[PDB]
Short mmCIF file of C-alpha atoms and ligand atoms in Angstrom, two decimals:
data_model
loop_
_atom_site.label_atom_id
_atom_site.label_comp_id
_atom_site.label_asym_id
_atom_site.label_seq_id
_atom_site.Cartn_x
_atom_site.Cartn_y
_atom_site.Cartn_z
CA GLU X 24 127.05 86.66 86.86
CA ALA X 25 126.08 87.73 83.34
CA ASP X 26 123.37 84.87 83.19
CA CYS X 27 121.25 86.49 85.87
CA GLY X 28 117.52 86.16 85.57
CA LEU X 29 117.70 83.36 83.21
CA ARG X 30 116.64 80.32 85.15
CA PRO X 31 118.33 77.15 83.77
CA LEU X 32 115.16 75.00 83.87
CA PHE X 33 112.89 77.61 82.11
CA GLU X 34 114.42 80.66 80.38
CA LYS X 35 117.48 78.81 79.29
CA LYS X 36 115.67 75.54 78.38
CA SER X 37 113.09 77.71 76.57
CA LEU X 38 110.22 77.14 78.99
CA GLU X 39 107.71 79.14 80.99
CA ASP X 40 106.56 78.57 84.46
CA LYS X 41 102.90 78.11 85.29
CA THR X 42 102.18 81.70 86.08
CA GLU X 43 104.73 84.07 84.35
CA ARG X 44 102.12 84.80 81.67
CA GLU X 45 100.25 86.71 84.37
CA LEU X 46 103.36 89.03 84.83
CA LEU X 47 103.75 89.57 81.12
CA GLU X 48 100.07 90.22 80.55
CA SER X 49 99.84 92.77 83.32
CA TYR X 50 102.00 94.98 81.11
CA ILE X 51 99.31 95.40 78.56
CA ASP X 52 95.67 95.18 80.19
CA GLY X 53 94.72 91.95 81.91
CA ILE L 30 102.92 82.82 101.68
CA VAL L 31 99.09 83.44 101.75
CA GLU L 32 97.10 82.19 98.77
CA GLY L 33 100.26 80.89 97.19
CA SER L 34 100.61 77.64 95.31
CA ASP L 35 103.42 75.05 95.35
CA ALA L 36 106.36 76.09 93.15
CA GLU L 37 107.72 74.30 90.16
CA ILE L 38 111.12 72.67 90.34
CA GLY L 39 113.88 75.27 89.87
CA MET L 40 111.37 78.21 89.47
CA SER L 41 113.12 80.44 91.82
CA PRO L 42 116.89 79.47 91.91
CA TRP L 43 117.88 82.57 93.68
CA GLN L 44 115.70 81.78 96.66
CA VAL L 45 117.83 81.71 99.79
CA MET L 46 116.61 80.54 103.15
CA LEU L 47 117.98 82.06 106.52
CA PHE L 48 118.16 79.65 109.38
CA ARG L 49 119.52 80.05 112.89
CA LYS L 50 122.24 77.72 114.05
CA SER L 51 121.27 76.82 117.72
CA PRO L 52 118.27 76.35 117.66
CA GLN L 53 117.95 75.10 113.94
CA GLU L 54 114.99 77.41 113.31
CA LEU L 55 114.00 79.18 110.17
CA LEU L 56 114.47 82.85 110.46
CA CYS L 57 113.76 84.47 107.08
CA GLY L 58 113.92 84.28 103.28
CA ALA L 59 116.51 85.85 101.16
CA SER L 60 117.95 86.02 97.56
CA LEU L 61 121.09 85.05 95.71
CA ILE L 62 122.59 87.96 93.67
CA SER L 63 126.22 86.87 92.97
CA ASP L 64 128.26 83.80 93.57
CA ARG L 65 128.92 84.73 97.18
CA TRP L 66 126.47 87.57 98.11
CA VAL L 67 122.92 87.11 99.63
CA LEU L 68 120.38 89.71 100.06
CA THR L 69 117.85 89.90 102.92
CA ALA L 70 115.87 92.48 105.01
CA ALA L 71 117.73 94.15 107.79
CA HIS L 72 114.96 93.56 110.47
CA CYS L 73 115.56 89.77 109.88
CA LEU L 74 119.01 90.37 111.53
CA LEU L 75 118.76 93.54 113.66
CA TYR L 76 115.47 94.57 115.34
CA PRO L 77 116.14 95.70 118.90
CA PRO L 78 112.47 95.78 120.06
CA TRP L 79 112.39 92.04 119.94
CA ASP L 80 116.02 91.48 121.08
CA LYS L 81 117.25 90.74 117.55
CA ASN L 82 120.84 91.37 117.02
CA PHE L 83 122.43 88.47 115.05
CA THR L 84 126.06 88.14 114.11
CA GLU L 85 127.76 86.12 111.36
CA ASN L 86 128.26 83.09 113.64
CA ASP L 87 124.67 83.12 114.99
CA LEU L 88 123.08 81.76 111.63
CA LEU L 89 123.41 80.11 108.32
CA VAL L 90 121.71 79.94 104.96
CA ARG L 91 120.32 77.21 102.61
CA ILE L 92 120.03 77.43 98.91
CA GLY L 93 118.52 75.31 96.11
CA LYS L 94 115.91 73.82 98.45
CA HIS L 95 112.60 72.75 96.90
CA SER L 96 110.85 70.55 99.50
CA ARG L 97 111.26 72.19 103.01
CA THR L 98 110.85 68.66 104.47
CA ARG L 99 113.02 65.96 103.01
CA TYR L 100 116.65 67.13 102.53
CA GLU L 101 117.87 66.87 99.05
CA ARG L 102 121.70 66.07 98.87
CA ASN L 103 123.79 67.45 95.91
CA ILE L 104 121.28 69.91 94.59
CA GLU L 105 120.62 71.97 97.76
CA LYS L 106 123.57 73.42 99.70
CA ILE L 107 124.16 75.05 103.14
CA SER L 108 126.41 77.97 103.69
CA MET L 109 128.11 80.01 106.50
CA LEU L 110 128.25 83.74 106.64
CA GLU L 111 131.80 85.51 106.56
CA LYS L 112 130.29 88.95 107.23
CA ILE L 113 126.92 90.70 107.61
CA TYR L 114 126.44 94.35 106.47
CA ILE L 115 123.38 96.38 107.49
CA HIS L 116 122.48 99.56 105.91
CA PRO L 117 123.81 102.34 108.17
CA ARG L 118 120.72 104.46 107.86
CA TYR L 119 118.30 101.55 108.31
CA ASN L 120 115.65 103.17 110.64
CA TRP L 121 114.12 100.38 112.70
CA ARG L 122 113.10 103.07 115.14
CA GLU L 123 110.10 104.53 113.19
CA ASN L 124 109.07 102.51 110.13
CA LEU L 125 111.80 99.99 108.89
CA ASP L 126 112.93 102.69 106.41
CA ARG L 127 115.95 101.42 104.37
CA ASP L 128 115.06 97.89 105.41
CA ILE L 129 117.93 95.84 103.76
CA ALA L 130 120.98 93.83 104.62
CA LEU L 131 123.67 91.95 102.70
CA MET L 132 125.50 88.89 103.71
CA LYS L 133 128.77 87.57 102.42
CA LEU L 134 129.24 83.77 102.16
CA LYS L 135 132.31 82.29 103.75
CA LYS L 136 133.07 80.34 100.58
CA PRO L 137 131.34 81.13 97.19
CA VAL L 138 128.62 78.83 95.83
CA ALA L 139 128.46 76.99 92.56
CA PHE L 140 125.42 77.44 90.34
CA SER L 141 123.39 74.55 89.08
CA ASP L 142 119.94 73.90 87.48
CA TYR L 143 118.55 74.88 90.89
CA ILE L 144 120.94 77.53 92.38
CA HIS L 145 121.25 80.54 90.07
CA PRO L 146 121.47 84.31 90.89
CA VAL L 147 118.78 86.87 90.36
CA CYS L 148 119.47 90.13 88.61
CA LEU L 149 119.35 93.65 90.11
CA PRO L 150 117.58 96.45 88.16
CA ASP L 151 119.14 99.51 86.37
CA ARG L 152 117.44 102.80 86.25
CA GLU L 153 115.57 101.93 83.20
CA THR L 154 114.05 98.64 84.21
CA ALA L 155 113.13 100.02 87.70
CA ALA L 156 111.47 103.12 86.21
CA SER L 157 109.59 101.10 83.52
CA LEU L 158 108.50 98.06 85.50
CA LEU L 159 107.78 99.32 89.17
CA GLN L 160 104.44 100.84 88.17
CA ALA L 161 100.95 100.44 89.73
CA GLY L 162 99.03 97.61 88.18
CA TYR L 163 101.94 95.48 87.10
CA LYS L 164 102.46 92.16 88.89
CA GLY L 165 105.57 90.98 90.65
CA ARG L 166 106.55 87.57 92.23
CA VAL L 167 107.02 86.86 95.95
CA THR L 168 108.44 83.56 97.13
CA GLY L 169 108.90 82.05 100.60
CA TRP L 170 108.28 79.20 103.08
CA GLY L 171 106.15 81.38 105.41
CA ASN L 172 102.93 80.83 107.24
CA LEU L 173 100.09 79.96 104.86
CA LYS L 174 97.77 82.19 107.05
CA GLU L 175 98.05 85.01 109.40
CA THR L 176 97.46 82.93 112.39
CA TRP L 177 98.53 79.20 112.63
CA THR L 178 96.60 76.58 114.50
CA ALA L 179 96.92 72.78 114.92
CA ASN L 180 97.18 71.66 111.24
CA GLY L 181 100.63 76.26 108.39
CA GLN L 182 104.27 75.66 107.58
CA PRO L 183 104.45 74.49 103.92
CA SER L 184 106.29 71.46 102.52
CA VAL L 185 107.64 73.11 99.40
CA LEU L 186 108.27 76.72 98.30
CA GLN L 187 105.25 78.94 98.03
CA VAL L 188 104.83 81.77 95.50
CA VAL L 189 102.38 84.61 94.68
CA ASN L 190 102.04 87.03 91.80
CA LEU L 191 100.85 90.37 93.44
CA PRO L 192 100.07 93.50 91.62
CA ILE L 193 101.74 96.76 92.60
CA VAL L 194 99.63 99.46 94.38
CA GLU L 195 99.79 103.26 93.86
CA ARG L 196 101.86 105.09 96.54
CA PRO L 197 98.70 107.07 97.81
CA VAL L 198 96.59 104.04 98.29
CA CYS L 199 99.54 102.42 100.04
CA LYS L 200 100.19 105.18 102.57
CA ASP L 201 96.34 105.47 103.08
CA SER L 202 96.19 101.68 103.97
CA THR L 203 98.45 102.00 106.96
CA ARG L 204 99.62 104.44 109.64
CA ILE L 205 103.29 104.25 108.80
CA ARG L 206 105.06 106.90 107.04
CA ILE L 207 106.10 105.14 103.73
CA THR L 208 109.23 106.49 102.12
CA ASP L 209 110.73 106.50 98.68
CA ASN L 210 112.70 103.40 99.70
CA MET L 211 109.65 101.27 99.89
CA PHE L 212 106.71 100.40 97.82
CA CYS L 213 103.54 98.23 98.46
CA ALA L 214 101.76 95.68 96.52
CA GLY L 215 98.76 93.37 96.82
CA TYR L 216 95.27 93.20 95.47
CA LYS L 217 92.31 95.30 96.57
CA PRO L 218 88.90 94.79 98.38
CA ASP L 219 86.73 95.03 95.23
CA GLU L 220 89.19 93.08 93.15
CA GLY L 221 88.12 89.58 94.30
CA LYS L 222 91.75 88.25 94.54
CA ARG L 223 93.92 87.73 97.48
CA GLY L 224 97.74 87.10 98.32
CA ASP L 225 100.44 88.28 100.61
CA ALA L 226 103.74 87.46 102.07
CA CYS L 227 103.51 86.35 105.73
CA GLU L 228 105.59 85.21 108.70
CA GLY L 229 109.00 84.02 107.85
CA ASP L 230 108.66 85.32 104.23
CA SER L 231 110.44 88.51 105.16
CA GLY L 232 113.74 89.32 103.62
CA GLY L 233 112.76 87.27 100.47
CA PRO L 234 112.81 88.52 96.92
CA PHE L 235 110.16 90.37 95.08
CA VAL L 236 110.84 89.92 91.42
CA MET L 237 109.45 90.72 87.97
CA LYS L 238 110.33 89.31 84.51
CA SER L 239 111.64 92.14 82.18
CA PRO L 240 109.81 92.42 78.88
CA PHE L 241 112.95 93.73 77.37
CA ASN L 242 115.25 90.75 77.76
CA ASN L 243 113.06 88.11 79.51
CA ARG L 244 115.16 88.16 82.57
CA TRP L 245 114.10 88.13 86.27
CA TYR L 246 114.94 91.26 88.31
CA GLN L 247 114.60 91.77 91.94
CA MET L 248 112.53 94.95 92.40
CA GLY L 249 111.60 94.43 96.18
CA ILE L 250 112.40 92.69 99.42
CA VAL L 251 109.60 91.46 101.67
CA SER L 252 109.54 94.06 104.35
CA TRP L 253 106.42 94.36 106.48
CA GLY L 254 102.68 94.31 106.63
CA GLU L 255 99.74 94.49 109.05
CA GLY L 256 99.20 90.74 109.65
CA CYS L 257 98.81 88.75 106.46
CA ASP L 258 96.47 89.14 103.49
CA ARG L 259 94.20 91.66 105.11
CA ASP L 260 91.34 93.59 103.31
CA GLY L 261 92.42 97.24 103.01
CA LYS L 262 96.09 96.46 103.95
CA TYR L 263 99.10 95.70 101.68
CA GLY L 264 102.61 94.02 101.65
CA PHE L 265 105.33 96.59 101.88
CA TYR L 266 108.61 95.79 100.10
CA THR L 267 112.02 97.52 100.11
CA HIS L 268 112.52 99.35 96.80
CA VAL L 269 115.58 97.43 95.89
CA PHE L 270 116.77 100.09 93.31
CA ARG L 271 117.08 103.19 95.47
CA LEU L 272 119.48 101.52 97.95
CA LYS L 273 121.50 99.77 95.10
CA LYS L 274 124.04 102.58 95.56
CA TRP L 275 124.69 101.12 99.03
CA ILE L 276 124.83 97.56 97.53
CA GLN L 277 127.73 98.70 95.33
CA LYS L 278 129.70 100.45 98.07
CA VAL L 279 129.85 97.26 100.00
CA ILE L 280 130.20 94.69 97.27
CA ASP L 281 132.73 96.94 95.53
CA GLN L 282 134.78 97.46 98.63
CA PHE L 283 134.63 94.04 100.38
CA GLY L 284 134.58 91.89 97.31
N1 LIG O 326 107.52 97.91 113.40
C1 LIG O 326 106.99 98.92 112.76
O1 LIG O 326 106.32 99.75 113.31
C2 LIG O 326 107.18 98.89 111.19
S1 LIG O 326 106.01 97.77 110.35
C3 LIG O 326 106.13 96.17 111.08
C4 LIG O 326 104.77 95.98 111.93
C5 LIG O 326 104.83 94.81 112.77
N2 LIG O 326 105.07 93.62 111.88
C6 LIG O 326 103.85 92.69 111.58
O2 LIG O 326 102.80 92.87 112.12
C7 LIG O 326 104.08 91.44 110.69
C8 LIG O 326 103.28 90.32 111.10
C9 LIG O 326 103.35 89.09 110.00
N3 LIG O 326 103.20 89.77 108.61
C10 LIG O 326 104.46 89.62 107.66
O3 LIG O 326 105.44 89.02 108.06
C11 LIG O 326 104.33 90.42 106.37
C12 LIG O 326 103.16 90.72 105.68
C13 LIG O 326 103.39 91.40 104.37
C14 LIG O 326 104.71 91.52 104.00
CL1 LIG O 326 105.39 92.31 102.64
S2 LIG O 326 105.61 90.90 105.42
N4 LIG O 326 105.49 91.08 110.64
C15 LIG O 326 106.38 91.79 109.77
O4 LIG O 326 106.01 92.71 109.11
C16 LIG O 326 107.97 91.42 109.85
C17 LIG O 326 108.80 92.24 110.92
C18 LIG O 326 108.62 93.72 110.83
C19 LIG O 326 109.37 94.33 111.90
C20 LIG O 326 110.02 93.74 112.80
C21 LIG O 326 110.07 92.29 112.85
C22 LIG O 326 109.38 91.63 111.93
C1 LIG O 327 123.44 95.24 119.01
O1 LIG O 327 122.81 96.56 119.01
C2 LIG O 327 123.27 97.03 120.12
C3 LIG O 327 122.17 97.99 120.66
O2 LIG O 327 121.33 97.17 121.66
C4 LIG O 327 124.74 97.48 120.15
O3 LIG O 327 125.14 97.54 121.43
C5 LIG O 327 125.61 96.28 119.53
O4 LIG O 327 126.79 96.91 118.98
C6 LIG O 327 125.02 95.28 118.53
N1 LIG O 327 125.67 94.06 118.78
C7 LIG O 327 126.82 93.59 118.23
C8 LIG O 327 127.60 94.40 117.09
O5 LIG O 327 127.34 92.55 118.59
#
Protein backbone atom coordinates (compact mmCIF):
# COMPACT_ATOMS: atom_id res chain seq x y z
CA GLU A 1 0.00 0.00 0.00
CA ALA A 2 2.99 2.24 0.71
CA ASP A 3 4.80 1.01 -2.43
CA CYS A 4 2.25 2.54 -4.81
CA GLY A 5 3.40 3.92 -8.15
CA LEU A 6 6.69 2.01 -7.93
CA ARG A 7 6.49 -0.68 -10.59
CA PRO A 8 8.45 -3.80 -9.55
CA LEU A 9 9.98 -4.37 -13.00
CA PHE A 10 10.95 -0.70 -13.49
CA GLU A 11 10.99 1.90 -10.70
CA LYS A 12 12.03 -0.72 -8.14
CA LYS A 13 14.56 -2.46 -10.39
CA SER A 14 15.79 1.03 -11.41
CA LEU A 15 14.54 0.91 -15.00
CA GLU A 16 12.54 3.22 -17.24
CA ASP A 17 9.85 2.21 -19.68
CA LYS A 18 10.21 3.02 -23.37
CA THR A 19 8.15 6.24 -23.17
CA GLU A 20 8.17 7.74 -19.64
CA ARG A 21 10.88 10.20 -20.72
CA GLU A 22 8.06 11.86 -22.68
CA LEU A 23 6.07 12.43 -19.49
CA LEU A 24 9.12 13.73 -17.64
CA GLU A 25 10.18 16.03 -20.50
CA SER A 26 6.68 17.48 -20.86
CA TYR A 27 7.31 19.20 -17.51
CA ILE A 28 10.05 21.48 -18.90
CA ASP A 29 9.46 22.17 -22.61
CA GLY A 30 9.50 19.28 -25.09
CA ILE B 1 -6.31 2.50 -27.77
CA VAL B 2 -5.82 4.53 -30.94
CA GLU B 3 -2.22 5.20 -32.06
CA GLY B 4 -1.03 3.13 -29.10
CA SER B 5 1.91 0.77 -29.03
CA ASP B 6 2.24 -2.61 -27.35
CA ALA B 7 3.17 -2.29 -23.68
CA GLU B 8 6.28 -3.62 -22.02
CA ILE B 9 5.99 -6.52 -19.58
CA GLY B 10 4.80 -5.23 -16.21
CA MET B 11 4.56 -1.62 -17.39
CA SER B 12 1.08 -1.03 -15.89
CA PRO B 13 0.71 -3.47 -12.98
CA TRP B 14 -2.41 -1.64 -11.72
CA GLN B 15 -4.24 -2.32 -14.99
CA VAL B 16 -7.46 -4.22 -14.22
CA MET B 17 -9.80 -5.65 -16.86
CA LEU B 18 -13.59 -5.72 -16.41
CA PHE B 19 -15.26 -8.80 -17.95
CA ARG B 20 -18.88 -9.98 -17.92
CA LYS B 21 -19.62 -13.46 -16.59
CA SER B 22 -22.18 -14.81 -19.07
CA PRO B 23 -21.32 -14.06 -21.86
CA GLN B 24 -17.54 -13.97 -21.20
CA GLU B 25 -17.26 -10.52 -22.77
CA LEU B 26 -14.84 -7.69 -22.03
CA LEU B 27 -16.78 -4.73 -20.65
CA CYS B 28 -14.18 -2.17 -19.61
CA GLY B 29 -10.83 -1.28 -18.12
CA ALA B 30 -10.10 -0.36 -14.52
CA SER B 31 -7.26 0.19 -12.05
CA LEU B 32 -5.97 -1.42 -8.85
CA ILE B 33 -5.58 1.07 -5.99
CA SER B 34 -5.40 -1.19 -2.93
CA ASP B 35 -5.07 -4.91 -2.23
CA ARG B 36 -8.85 -5.35 -2.67
CA TRP B 37 -10.28 -2.14 -4.20
CA VAL B 38 -10.63 -1.55 -7.95
CA LEU B 39 -11.49 1.77 -9.62
CA THR B 40 -13.51 2.08 -12.84
CA ALA B 41 -15.94 4.49 -14.50
CA ALA B 42 -19.58 4.52 -13.43
CA HIS B 43 -21.06 4.21 -16.94
CA CYS B 44 -19.20 0.90 -17.29
CA LEU B 45 -21.63 -0.46 -14.66
CA LEU B 46 -24.70 1.82 -14.72
CA TYR B 47 -25.91 3.51 -17.91
CA PRO B 48 -29.70 3.19 -18.31
CA PRO B 49 -30.05 4.52 -21.91
CA TRP B 50 -28.35 1.29 -23.06
CA ASP B 51 -29.93 -0.98 -20.39
CA LYS B 52 -26.71 -1.14 -18.33
CA ASN B 53 -27.41 -1.91 -14.66
CA PHE B 54 -24.85 -4.43 -13.50
CA THR B 55 -24.59 -5.99 -10.06
CA GLU B 56 -21.75 -7.78 -8.28
CA ASN B 57 -22.68 -11.25 -9.52
CA ASP B 58 -22.97 -10.05 -13.13
CA LEU B 59 -19.26 -9.57 -13.82
CA LEU B 60 -15.67 -10.24 -12.77
CA VAL B 61 -12.20 -8.72 -13.15
CA ARG B 62 -8.81 -9.92 -14.41
CA ILE B 63 -5.47 -8.54 -13.22
CA GLY B 64 -1.85 -8.89 -14.28
CA LYS B 65 -2.69 -9.82 -17.88
CA HIS B 66 -0.19 -8.88 -20.59
CA SER B 67 -1.28 -10.80 -23.72
CA ARG B 68 -5.08 -10.60 -24.03
CA THR B 69 -4.89 -13.80 -26.11
CA ARG B 70 -3.02 -16.64 -24.41
CA TYR B 71 -3.88 -17.05 -20.73
CA GLU B 72 -0.90 -16.81 -18.37
CA ARG B 73 -1.29 -18.94 -15.25
CA ASN B 74 0.33 -17.92 -11.93
CA ILE B 75 1.08 -14.32 -12.93
CA GLU B 76 -2.41 -13.20 -13.93
CA LYS B 77 -5.48 -13.59 -11.72
CA ILE B 78 -9.27 -13.50 -11.87
CA SER B 79 -11.46 -12.07 -9.13
CA MET B 80 -15.09 -11.77 -8.05
CA LEU B 81 -16.79 -8.64 -6.73
CA GLU B 82 -18.15 -8.49 -3.19
CA LYS B 83 -19.83 -5.12 -3.72
CA ILE B 84 -20.08 -2.29 -6.25
CA TYR B 85 -20.31 1.36 -5.16
CA ILE B 86 -21.42 3.97 -7.71
CA HIS B 87 -21.10 7.65 -6.82
CA PRO B 88 -24.57 8.78 -5.66
CA ARG B 89 -24.35 12.06 -7.61
CA TYR B 90 -23.10 10.43 -10.82
CA ASN B 91 -25.15 12.29 -13.43
CA TRP B 92 -25.52 9.95 -16.40
CA ARG B 93 -28.61 11.94 -17.38
CA GLU B 94 -26.77 14.98 -18.79
CA ASN B 95 -23.04 14.51 -19.29
CA LEU B 96 -21.59 11.65 -17.17
CA ASP B 97 -20.63 14.14 -14.47
CA ARG B 98 -18.96 12.47 -11.48
CA ASP B 99 -18.34 9.42 -13.70
CA ILE B 100 -16.67 7.04 -11.24
CA ALA B 101 -17.29 3.71 -9.50
CA LEU B 102 -15.48 1.51 -6.99
CA MET B 103 -15.53 -2.27 -6.66
CA LYS B 104 -14.57 -4.35 -3.63
CA LEU B 105 -12.95 -7.71 -4.36
CA LYS B 106 -14.48 -10.73 -2.63
CA LYS B 107 -10.99 -11.77 -1.50
CA PRO B 108 -7.95 -9.46 -1.55
CA VAL B 109 -5.28 -9.92 -4.21
CA ALA B 110 -1.56 -10.58 -3.74
CA PHE B 111 0.98 -8.29 -5.39
CA SER B 112 3.73 -9.59 -7.66
CA ASP B 113 6.08 -8.29 -10.34
CA TYR B 114 2.95 -7.86 -12.50
CA ILE B 115 0.14 -6.94 -10.06
CA HIS B 116 0.88 -3.71 -8.18
CA PRO B 117 -1.37 -0.84 -7.03
CA VAL B 118 -1.33 2.65 -8.52
CA CYS B 119 -1.18 5.64 -6.20
CA LEU B 120 -3.89 8.24 -5.78
CA PRO B 121 -3.02 11.94 -5.83
CA ASP B 122 -2.87 14.49 -3.04
CA ARG B 123 -3.79 18.17 -3.34
CA GLU B 124 -0.20 19.10 -4.17
CA THR B 125 0.46 16.48 -6.85
CA ALA B 126 -2.91 17.09 -8.51
CA ALA B 127 -2.55 20.88 -8.52
CA SER B 128 1.06 20.65 -9.73
CA LEU B 129 0.71 18.00 -12.45
CA LEU B 130 -2.80 18.33 -13.92
CA GLN B 131 -1.85 21.30 -16.10
CA ALA B 132 -2.30 21.87 -19.81
CA GLY B 133 0.68 20.71 -21.84
CA TYR B 134 1.85 17.96 -19.50
CA LYS B 135 1.43 14.38 -20.71
CA GLY B 136 -0.32 11.51 -18.96
CA ARG B 137 -0.59 7.80 -19.73
CA VAL B 138 -3.67 5.87 -20.87
CA THR B 139 -3.85 2.07 -21.04
CA GLY B 140 -6.41 -0.41 -22.31
CA TRP B 141 -7.33 -3.29 -24.60
CA GLY B 142 -9.78 -1.22 -26.64
CA ASN B 143 -10.51 -0.89 -30.33
CA LEU B 144 -7.40 0.30 -32.16
CA LYS B 145 -9.66 2.47 -34.36
CA GLU B 146 -13.02 4.20 -34.07
CA THR B 147 -14.78 1.73 -36.39
CA TRP B 148 -13.61 -1.88 -36.65
CA THR B 149 -13.92 -3.95 -39.82
CA ALA B 150 -12.78 -7.45 -40.81
CA ASN B 151 -9.16 -7.55 -39.63
CA GLY B 152 -9.19 -4.14 -34.16
CA GLN B 153 -8.98 -6.05 -30.89
CA PRO B 154 -5.38 -6.01 -29.65
CA SER B 155 -3.30 -8.96 -28.49
CA VAL B 156 -1.45 -7.19 -25.66
CA LEU B 157 -2.05 -4.06 -23.59
CA GLN B 158 -2.10 -0.78 -25.53
CA VAL B 159 -0.79 2.51 -24.16
CA VAL B 160 -0.60 6.16 -25.22
CA ASN B 161 1.01 9.27 -23.75
CA LEU B 162 -1.49 12.10 -24.33
CA PRO B 163 -0.98 15.75 -23.33
CA ILE B 164 -3.54 17.63 -21.28
CA VAL B 165 -5.70 20.28 -22.97
CA GLU B 166 -6.84 23.61 -21.54
CA ARG B 167 -10.37 23.61 -20.12
CA PRO B 168 -11.62 26.25 -22.63
CA VAL B 169 -10.37 24.30 -25.66
CA CYS B 170 -11.95 21.17 -24.16
CA LYS B 171 -15.38 22.73 -23.61
CA ASP B 172 -15.13 24.26 -27.09
CA SER B 173 -14.45 20.88 -28.71
CA THR B 174 -17.74 19.33 -27.58
CA ARG B 175 -21.34 20.30 -26.84
CA ILE B 176 -21.30 18.67 -23.39
CA ARG B 177 -21.13 20.89 -20.31
CA ILE B 178 -17.78 19.85 -18.86
CA THR B 179 -17.51 20.18 -15.09
CA ASP B 180 -14.82 20.56 -12.44
CA ASN B 181 -14.94 16.76 -12.02
CA MET B 182 -13.61 16.11 -15.54
CA PHE B 183 -10.64 17.20 -17.64
CA CYS B 184 -9.77 16.47 -21.26
CA ALA B 185 -6.59 15.42 -23.02
CA GLY B 186 -5.31 14.73 -26.50
CA TYR B 187 -3.19 16.39 -29.13
CA LYS B 188 -4.35 19.12 -31.53
CA PRO B 189 -5.07 19.52 -35.26
CA ASP B 190 -1.89 21.54 -35.92
CA GLU B 191 0.21 19.36 -33.64
CA GLY B 192 0.93 16.52 -36.09
CA LYS B 193 0.34 13.87 -33.43
CA ARG B 194 -2.58 11.55 -32.70
CA GLY B 195 -3.84 9.28 -29.94
CA ASP B 196 -7.00 8.58 -27.95
CA ALA B 197 -8.71 6.01 -25.75
CA CYS B 198 -11.46 4.12 -27.55
CA GLU B 199 -14.18 1.49 -27.15
CA GLY B 200 -13.65 -0.78 -24.16
CA ASP B 201 -10.87 1.46 -22.80
CA SER B 202 -13.42 3.31 -20.65
CA GLY B 203 -12.97 3.07 -16.90
CA GLY B 204 -9.24 2.54 -17.31
CA PRO B 205 -6.55 4.58 -15.56
CA PHE B 206 -5.10 7.89 -16.72
CA VAL B 207 -1.74 8.18 -14.92
CA MET B 208 1.34 10.40 -14.67
CA LYS B 209 4.75 9.94 -13.05
CA SER B 210 5.39 12.47 -10.29
CA PRO B 211 8.70 14.38 -10.62
CA PHE B 212 8.78 14.69 -6.81
CA ASN B 213 9.01 10.98 -5.94
CA ASN B 214 9.12 9.08 -9.28
CA ARG B 215 5.80 7.42 -8.44
CA TRP B 216 2.86 6.82 -10.77
CA TYR B 217 -0.39 8.55 -9.77
CA GLN B 218 -3.84 8.14 -11.30
CA MET B 219 -5.04 11.61 -12.30
CA GLY B 220 -7.96 10.47 -14.47
CA ILE B 221 -10.38 7.75 -15.50
CA VAL B 222 -11.23 7.10 -19.16
CA SER B 223 -14.68 8.67 -19.35
CA TRP B 224 -15.95 9.59 -22.82
CA GLY B 225 -15.33 11.12 -26.23
CA GLU B 226 -16.83 11.80 -29.66
CA GLY B 227 -15.77 8.63 -31.43
CA CYS B 228 -12.04 7.92 -31.22
CA ASP B 229 -9.03 10.08 -32.16
CA ARG B 230 -11.00 12.75 -33.99
CA ASP B 231 -9.57 16.04 -35.20
CA GLY B 232 -11.00 18.85 -33.10
CA LYS B 233 -12.19 16.43 -30.39
CA TYR B 234 -10.51 15.16 -27.23
CA GLY B 235 -10.75 12.35 -24.71
CA PHE B 236 -12.50 13.32 -21.48
CA TYR B 237 -11.40 11.74 -18.20
CA THR B 238 -12.75 11.85 -14.65
CA HIS B 239 -10.73 14.23 -12.47
CA VAL B 240 -9.77 11.49 -10.00
CA PHE B 241 -8.81 13.94 -7.26
CA ARG B 242 -12.04 15.93 -6.87
CA LEU B 243 -14.06 12.82 -6.01
CA LYS B 244 -11.33 11.32 -3.80
CA LYS B 245 -13.40 12.51 -0.85
CA TRP B 246 -16.03 9.96 -1.91
CA ILE B 247 -13.29 7.34 -2.39
CA GLN B 248 -12.50 7.75 1.31
CA LYS B 249 -16.10 7.66 2.58
CA VAL B 250 -16.59 4.22 1.02
CA ILE B 251 -13.21 2.56 1.61
CA ASP B 252 -13.07 4.09 5.10
CA GLN B 253 -16.54 2.77 6.00
CA PHE B 254 -16.68 -0.56 4.14
CA GLY B 255 -13.01 -1.55 4.56
N1 LIG C 1 -23.84 10.30 -23.27
C1 LIG C 1 -23.49 11.54 -23.14
O1 LIG C 1 -24.18 12.42 -23.61
C2 LIG C 1 -22.18 11.90 -22.38
S1 LIG C 1 -20.72 11.69 -23.40
C3 LIG C 1 -20.70 10.06 -24.21
C4 LIG C 1 -21.17 10.21 -25.65
C5 LIG C 1 -21.40 8.87 -26.36
N2 LIG C 1 -20.17 8.00 -26.24
C6 LIG C 1 -19.29 7.76 -27.42
O2 LIG C 1 -19.55 8.26 -28.46
C7 LIG C 1 -18.04 6.87 -27.26
C8 LIG C 1 -17.75 6.06 -28.50
C9 LIG C 1 -16.34 5.35 -28.38
N3 LIG C 1 -15.39 6.33 -27.75
C10 LIG C 1 -14.76 6.04 -26.43
O3 LIG C 1 -15.00 5.02 -25.86
C11 LIG C 1 -13.80 7.07 -25.81
C12 LIG C 1 -13.07 8.09 -26.52
C13 LIG C 1 -12.25 8.92 -25.67
C14 LIG C 1 -12.31 8.58 -24.33
CL1 LIG C 1 -11.45 9.36 -22.99
S2 LIG C 1 -13.40 7.25 -24.20
N4 LIG C 1 -18.23 5.97 -26.12
C15 LIG C 1 -17.92 6.47 -24.75
O4 LIG C 1 -17.54 7.57 -24.62
C16 LIG C 1 -18.10 5.56 -23.51
C17 LIG C 1 -19.57 5.63 -23.00
C18 LIG C 1 -20.11 6.85 -22.60
C19 LIG C 1 -21.43 6.92 -22.15
C20 LIG C 1 -22.19 5.78 -22.09
C21 LIG C 1 -21.65 4.57 -22.48
C22 LIG C 1 -20.32 4.50 -22.95
C1 LIG D 1 -31.24 -0.23 -11.89
O1 LIG D 1 -31.50 1.15 -12.06
C2 LIG D 1 -32.91 1.13 -12.03
C3 LIG D 1 -33.56 2.20 -12.90
O2 LIG D 1 -33.85 1.61 -14.15
C4 LIG D 1 -33.39 0.84 -10.57
O3 LIG D 1 -34.70 0.34 -10.64
C5 LIG D 1 -32.59 -0.32 -9.89
O4 LIG D 1 -32.54 -0.14 -8.48
C6 LIG D 1 -31.20 -0.67 -10.40
N1 LIG D 1 -31.07 -2.10 -10.25
C7 LIG D 1 -30.63 -2.80 -9.17
C8 LIG D 1 -30.16 -2.08 -7.91
O5 LIG D 1 -30.60 -4.03 -9.21
